[PDB]
Design a protein around this ligand. Structure first.
Ligand SMILES: O=[N+]([O-])c1ccccc1O[C@@H]1O[C@H](CO)[C@H](O)[C@H](O)[C@H]1O
Ligand SMILES: O=[N+]([O-])c1ccccc1O[C@@H]1O[C@H](CO)[C@H](O)[C@H](O)[C@H]1O
Ligand SMILES: [Mg+2]
Ligand SMILES: [Mg+2]
Ligand SMILES: [Mg+2]
Ligand SMILES: [Mg+2]
Ligand SMILES: [Mg+2]
Ligand SMILES: [Mg+2]
Ligand code: NA
Ligand code: NA
Ligand code: NA
Ligand code: NA
Ligand code: NA
Lengths: 1011, 204
């Protein structure tokens, strides 16, 4: 049978799904969550052989190890060990679309393991094996005898081996198919890998055992009283002497307990469940769970004889919380949530899709430290430990069925087909059966990008029946279908409508009030963090705060799915789609994370942390009003640090304890502040600091900040008359100016400053010229490709208009001697094929002090596409160790992504002024700068700039960061104006109108001097 | 206005005057205006204006220049938005064209007098033998701002000698969501901090 080409066969001999079991035989060990002798890990070294198709596997392999096999670590993805290539495809299936068939060439992973079984496990009870994750379908043999089969790469497959094993040595044989009919439901936008990639374990259960248990917590009107109800089912030898006792603990204290014999209430004409029992425990003043304060109790489920013999015990962490939608709002414990979420795939740059605790913890810490309170499992159930971690550390979770059929045409072709209902059903029901007792899970999701089919409606209803405690969401088919309790669009913009036919993406604000609509709206994916992105992020947060029914969203996405490759010298480098010979592929579309693959932050992370702050501030006079956005906790680990500085020079500062109740306000009146009359801008900066460490943060962690310009003293002080006058010398080809030890040379044929000397030292490698283009960002390119150009993308519009190829034609260049200075005046026109795109008019005034004031006025044709920037650029001869500036920072910031930046005096190593995005583009800008120092130079004005060892040309011509090479000197880009970067999505122009350079005429001025 | 600087230079084909002034109040500097006037062989006068506005002072009603011309002319002709009065936040109905009206149509007789008759988006303005070119907003009439702000009923206004000309690089919106609470939208307040405009005055 080719069971892997039959959506009607999704398993053979598989045991029922259930919540996490450990079969403890001592209740204290179950209460403490210590390891159980009845639950062994089979992870470790296994034997593996790769075949090009299942037809190539020799039958001998069932009975004995293949000499040519290799010993490898399990869990693992075989692509990670180099057996075959991982493939990066977004939408288009990695196989020919012809359901339910797969390629006859289908990579088969033959895994095996010789392991030991203690005789005692075989003397009584049941011994099962558990494979938490096998991608994508597999057959299992034990001691050469066929056991069974399983599909669904993302949930555990359990088989009873009781009758196949023998005391001592036993051998498993697992034949894993890379492709199967299950593949048609696994088209998520990620690397296509395969293997036994989650844990393998062996569990001993008694013959009479706990087969399932469900825990519910319901409350009174004010949440001061609760009833914990635990339904427990058994399998096995049903006798009157059996009992179940459920006890509830708060630490070492037992807060409640109930014991009852089996036999549930009558449910119908045939009676009730004689194999079930419901225990109901009253709990007064329960400590409530939320992402803010993840209070947990421990529930211990003991199966025992009435006379006192514990048969076995199971247990779980319990979080008392109610989730409900009422009046159009999603409420948690009666209060409306504001979801600071992120979508997170399970990805490691070395291990592929294999997860480990360290990495999960690392992700949770960083999420919380960056003000996220929620995570969506895009787009499948996660490794079991994730849930445990979210329950304990406190994150709200959207648990999502492993169903994505994006590549079908139309997208609901399978989801609307009743023949695919059974396969889809298993993916939904088994997830709910496994994860229904985790308090962190607050919403169930039916899968992703699978259109809207009748199968979704049936499954929607199944969940609503089986688990009324959590809403159900699903974005497919338009994000507001009958299969979702929450309007949950992807990439809908804040104010801009995108009325696609059938599945329009309305502005989120407009969406909420469409005729008859009443549901809450929480974006399942928003703000595509691909490359230099997150422009416009603040716009979303302002809307979420203003509209009650706009309750947040999940950023797309947490971590880049780049994989490590090694060059000739064995040095690692970050690879993306196509870097493994994989084709077709979607190139860099796999990197959309707030953090790099090794968890280093991209600059956008700080923008997200800031907009997602939990304290809002307002300033009136010397009074700061702090407002808490926490719903349940007081600010019991927080203090406010404040500081006032004049142009980066600290004048005063202090700290005040924060004592604000949830949703409360606190007024803090600051001390008599500094009122200096020395020129400059006075800025107040406040930061919320957590003095005490927590489980997820170190003492002193900063959780929020905000700044305000206090008074400004404009400079009116006249500079001192100079003890000199620059001299001009002319030739047909140049204008040379000299002053003291300084000289400037302007080329009369080009019209640009070609060289400058400080002393005898040349300062420039390339002349100073206007620049109207940028090395395109991922959002500038969108989906455009050489082989398939998207004329609507910004990069293509610029290209086609000739921006990158335009040549400066000199229209004027004159030099004049003033009373105390030399003035050079120039004008240039940039044209393309007959079209004048931009005109640059400037003056350079060099005075007796040695400073050079440059004034620039640019005209931009109203009918050419708005340019990426309006600025100057040059390659300086100097390479200096540091960069010091008075302006926004310290991190990279762009006009539409600068709220998190603060104005101060910053000073960093040159290399931190470059952001190493995997796919190189314009990067490292800093905006709102008044003064920049680099080596001997100082530039003053009101501009944005970037400075690094890489020209815009090189960045635009290089596809991978590891191929960039430092150029001679330092490339400096100083812009009067720079276009937003966008990012509401990375496939349609997303720079908001207010961030486009469409004014027509632009003026900027800089003074360059030496120090 | 306090002078900070006033200089004159001769260039190959022109004369350049440079000035800088500070506007202050109770010892605070509110605004700083830096300009150049460049008069060439053609007789055109090119004015460049760069203004600084303290971040802590309220955003100003406008950033422009003004003068009382000695001449009184019959018509006003401009290449800009019109033909009727239009302001930044109330100019969608106006069209860009060449308009020509009697001077009095350049004044709006609001019963309670105030700033009135501006036209925005103007590239060229003609009055008598004078011509102003640039990208500005303007109003022109027989009444000074002072008079309008001192007068409560239009019937009491009197034509002053000559013509008052207000030429603005930038003008604040007028608002109107209500008339009892500030209603000019942020995008229409002059809060940029630094403003640049330039005009050419010449004889026609
Ligand atoms: O679905 N699509 O045809 C499609 C075409 C071009 C660009 C994005 C796109 O879909 C978008 O792709 C991004 C890539 O990070 C995510 O996978 C997102 O879920 C998906 O809707
Ligand atoms: O899906 N992608 O990430 C992606 C990256 C670059 C170029 C095309 C591309 O996807 C392609 O997008 C086009 C729309 O433009 C269609 O949706 C197509 O089905 C999808 O595969
Ligand atoms: Mg099958
Ligand atoms: Mg007991
Ligand atoms: Mg025995
Ligand atoms: Mg998809
Ligand atoms: Mg491709
Ligand atoms: Mg701010
Ligand atoms: Na809201
Ligand atoms: Na992606
Ligand atoms: Na506190
Ligand atoms: Na590039
Ligand atoms: Na008046």
């Amino acid at each position: 049978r080719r069971d892997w080409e039959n959506p009607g066969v999704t398993q053979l001999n598989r045991l029922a799904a259930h919540p996490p079991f450990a079969s403890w035989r001592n209740s204290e060990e179950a209460r403490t969550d210590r390891p159980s002798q009845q639950l062994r890990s089979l992870n470790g070294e296994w034997r593996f052989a790769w075949f090009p198709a299942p037809e190539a596997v020799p039958e001998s392999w069932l009975e004995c190890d293949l000499p040519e096999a290799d010993t490898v670590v399990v869990p693992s993805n075989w692509q990670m060990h180099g057996y075959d290539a991982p493939i990066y495809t977004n939408v288009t299936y990695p196989i020919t679309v012809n359901p339910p068939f797969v390629p006859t060439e289908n990579p088969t992973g033959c895994y095996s393991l010789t392991f030991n079984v203690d005789e005692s496990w075989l003397q009584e009870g049941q011994t099962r094996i558990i494979f938490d994750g096998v991608n994508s379908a597999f057959h299992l043999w034990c001691n050469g005898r066929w056991v069974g089969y399983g599909q669904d790469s993302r949930l555990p497959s359990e088989f009873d081996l009781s009758a196949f094993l023998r005391a001592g040595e036993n051998r498993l044989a697992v034949m894993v198919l890379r492709w199967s009919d299950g593949s048609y439901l696994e088209d998520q936008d990620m690397w296509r890998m395969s293997g036994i990639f989650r844990d393998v374990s062996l569990l001993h259960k008694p013959t009479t055992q706990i087969s399932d248990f469900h825990v519910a917590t319901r409350f009174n009107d004010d949440f001061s009283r609760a009833v914990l109800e635990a339904e427990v089912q058994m399998c096995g030898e049903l006798r009157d002497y059996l009992r179940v006792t459920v006890s509830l603990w708060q630490g070492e204290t037992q807060v409640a307990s109930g014991t009852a014999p089996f036999g549930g209430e009558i449910i119908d004409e045939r009676g009730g469940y004689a194999d079930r029992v419901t225990l109901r425990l009253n709990v007064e003043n329960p400590k409530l769970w939320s992402a803010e304060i993840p209070n947990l109790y421990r529930a211990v489920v003991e199966l025992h004889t009435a006379d006192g013999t514990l048969i076995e015990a199971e247990a779980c962490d319990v979080g008392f919380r109610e989730v409900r939608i009422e009046n159009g709002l999603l409420l948690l414990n009666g209060k409306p949530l504001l979801i600071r979420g992120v979508n997170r795939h399970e990805h490691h740059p070395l291990h592929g899709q294999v997860m480990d605790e360290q990495t999960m913890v690392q992700d949770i810490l960083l999420m919380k430290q960056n003000n996220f309170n929620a995570v969506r499992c895009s787009h499948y159930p996660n490794h079991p430990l994730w849930y445990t971690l979210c329950d304990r550390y406190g994150l709200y979770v959207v648990d999502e069925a492993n169903i994505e059929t994006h590549g079908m045409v139309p997208m609901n072709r399978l989801t609307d087909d009743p023949r695919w209902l059974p396969a889809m059903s298993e993916r939904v029901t088994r997830m709910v059966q496994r994860d229904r007792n985790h308090p962190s899970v607050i919403i169930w999701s039916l899968g992703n990008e699978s259109g809207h089919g009748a199968n979704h409606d049936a499954l929607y209803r199944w969940i609503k029946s089986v688990d009324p405690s959590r809403p159900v969401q699903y974005e497919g088919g338009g994000a507001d279908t009958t299969a979702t309790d929450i309007i949950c669009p992807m990439y809908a913009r804040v104010d801009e409508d995108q009325p696609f036919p059938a599945v329009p993406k309305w502005s989120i604000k407009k969406w909420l009030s469409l005729p008859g609509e009443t549901r809450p709206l929480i974006l399942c994916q928003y703000a595509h963090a691909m490359g230099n992105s997150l422009g416009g992020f603040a716009k979303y947060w302002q809307a979420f705060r203003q509209y009650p029914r706009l309750q947040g969203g999940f950023v797309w996405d947490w971590v880049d799915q780049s994989l490590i490759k090694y060059d000739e010298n064995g040095n690692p480098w970050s690879a993306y789609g196509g870097d493994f010979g994989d084709t077709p592929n979607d190139r860099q579309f796999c990197m959309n994370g707030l953090v790099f693959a090794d968890r280093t932050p991209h600059p956008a992370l700080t923008e997200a942390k800031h907009q997602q702050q939990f304290f809002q501030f307002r300033l009136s006079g010397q009074t700061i009003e702090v407002t808490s956005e926490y719903l349940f906790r007081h600010s019991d680990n927080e203090l406010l640090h404040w500081m006032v500085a004049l142009d980066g020079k600290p004048l005063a500062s202090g700290e005040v304890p924060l004592d604000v109740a949830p949703q409360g306000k606190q007024l803090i009146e600051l001390p008599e502040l500094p009122q200096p009359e020395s020129a400059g801008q006075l800025w107040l900066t406040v930061r919320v600091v957590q003095p005490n460490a927590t489980a997820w943060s170190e003492a002193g962690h900063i959780s929020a900040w905000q700044q305000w310009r206090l008074a400004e003293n404009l400079s009116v002080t006249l500079p001192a008359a100079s003890h000199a006058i620059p001299h001009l010398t002319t030739s047909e080809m140049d204008f040379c100016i000299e002053l003291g030890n300084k000289r400037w040379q302007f080329n009369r044929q080009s019209g640009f400053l070609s060289q400058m000397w400080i002393g005898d030292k040349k300062q420039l490698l390339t002349p100073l010229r206007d620049q109207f283009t940028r090395a395109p960002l991922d959002n500038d390119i969108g989906v455009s490709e050489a082989t398939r150009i998207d004329p609507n993308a910004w990069v293509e519009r610029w290209k086609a208009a000739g921006h990158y190829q335009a040549e400066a034609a000199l229209l004027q260049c004159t030099a004049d001697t003033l009373a105390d200075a030399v003035l050079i005046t120039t004008a240039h026109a940039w044209q393309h094929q007959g079209k004048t795109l931009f005109i640059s008019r400037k003056t350079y005034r060099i005075d007796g002090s040695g400073q050079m004031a440059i004034t620039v006025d640019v005209e931009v044709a109203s009918d050419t596409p708005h340019p990426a920037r309006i600025g100057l650029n040059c390659q300086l001869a100097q390479v200096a160790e540091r960069v010091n500036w008075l302006g926004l920072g310290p991190q990279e910031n762009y006009p539409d992504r600068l709220t998190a930046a603060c104005f101060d005096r910053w000073d960093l190593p040159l290399s931190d002024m470059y952001t190493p995005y995997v796919f190189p583009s314009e990067n490292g800008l800093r905006c709102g700068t008044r003064e920049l120092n680099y080596g001997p130079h100082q530039w003053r004005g009101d501009f944005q700039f970037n400075i690094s060892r890489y020209s815009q040309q090189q960045l635009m011509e290089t596809s991978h960061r590891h191929l960039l090479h430092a150029e001679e000197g330092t490339w400096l880009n100083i812009d009067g104006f720079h276009m937003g970067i966008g990012g509401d999505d990375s496939w349609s122009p997303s720079v908001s109108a207010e961030f486009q350079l469409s004014a027509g005429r632009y003026h900027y001025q800089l003074v360059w001097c030496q120090k």
